[PDB]
């Protein structure tokens, strides 16, 4: 699985997800969002299942982007939770949560939920 997951992915919004997987269970790389308060690439870090089930089940993985880089700071972070699905139509299917910083009065409105699909198709 380490082969398939490593590389460059794109989601349904046009965002670019560059990731290296290491055989211990680590995800590293960068994220460029096509939408939102975001410009250029952002450090991403995460983990995946190093020894996944060989019966057809996807490989569970997740990663986090804190939306601060050398250009702008959106005071938020997104975590993607999902699974990688091999086969020729190699896909990474996620649900995500995006939290931005708030006062305590506004905390009830701090988190967005959504879902992305990535493939390696430019």
């Amino acid at each position: 699985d380490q082969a398939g997951i490593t590389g460059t992915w794109y989601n349904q919004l046009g965002s670019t997800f560059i990731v290296t997987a290491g055989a211990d269970g680590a995800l590293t790389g960068t994220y460029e969002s096509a939408v939102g308060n975001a410009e250029s690439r952002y450090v991403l870090t995460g983990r995946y299942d190093s020894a996944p089930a060989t019966d057809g089940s996807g490989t569970a993985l997740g990663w986090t982007v804190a939306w601060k880089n050398n250009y702008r700071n959106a005071h938020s972070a997104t975590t993607w939770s999902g699974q990688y699905v091999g086969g020729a139509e190699a896909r990474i299917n996620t649900q995500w949560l995006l939290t931005y910083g708030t006062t305590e009065a506004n905390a009830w409105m701090s988190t967005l939920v959504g879902h992305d699909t990535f493939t390696k198709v430019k």
Copy 2:
């Protein structure tokens, strides 16, 4: 900031969240869950907003546990998204997604959602 986040946190389930924060925004550490297909400590990694807003809002952050250990492999990953609230009694408020590896037929049932609040006292 890093002094504030770094340390040992416990959520409402009794889980143990050991995290180190770097100047760059990095999060690293170990997570011990008191419930679930989990045993002993799992590797975690994430990110946090290195330079939060100046209006008294919380610090955005998130992290991912892949639930493979030397002892247990639950074929799942959890991502936590939320914010660090500093003050006399510091708090991390989060929402999390837990995805487990499925076939494509059962993908619709692959992701639990919940909310965790971590404090510095058990």
Copy 3:
């Protein structure tokens, strides 16, 4: 307004059947037939939509609840879908859903699934 647009029979990606009638002032009523899970046949659904939506190209907010009891079985669970109706050439209802099942207190942490369903008038 979108009363007629929403009203009808809709199908999601799973193959579930969503039969809904939208009333004059924002009521949703009808039945849901899941193609998956611990479910047989039609279940009662109720919901609300925004009966006076913006007209600035934005979707129409809605949501509804199914409890997974009918006369054939009881899955001790409810799902809520929250979403928007998008009109036009091919109408679509785009949703995210929360499925909660009964649990003890110490198992509450694992009570709720989340997912996304897209309904069209096809398949």
Copy 4:
């Protein structure tokens, strides 16, 4: 219905919002919702369902309901759905996660839904 009388009544969550509901013997939830925060004033219609024959075996009673945020004063072009369980006992509780969706353009649909969680008890 089992918990048809416990569920029924006037609840409050952690934000101070007010949840006034009536359960029917076979599953229906009807009532009004008055949010303490957000783009809302006064009461909004709500409808939902609950499991009227719950396992009387440790488990909570699964339920869910919806508010569209339009009434005679405001229209916030959004809807919230709560799903969760009623837990009876000495402190009856309703613990929920919620999804709030608001009308968006197609290019902005990605940002259309907030998730959160509300705890209701029958004490102001």
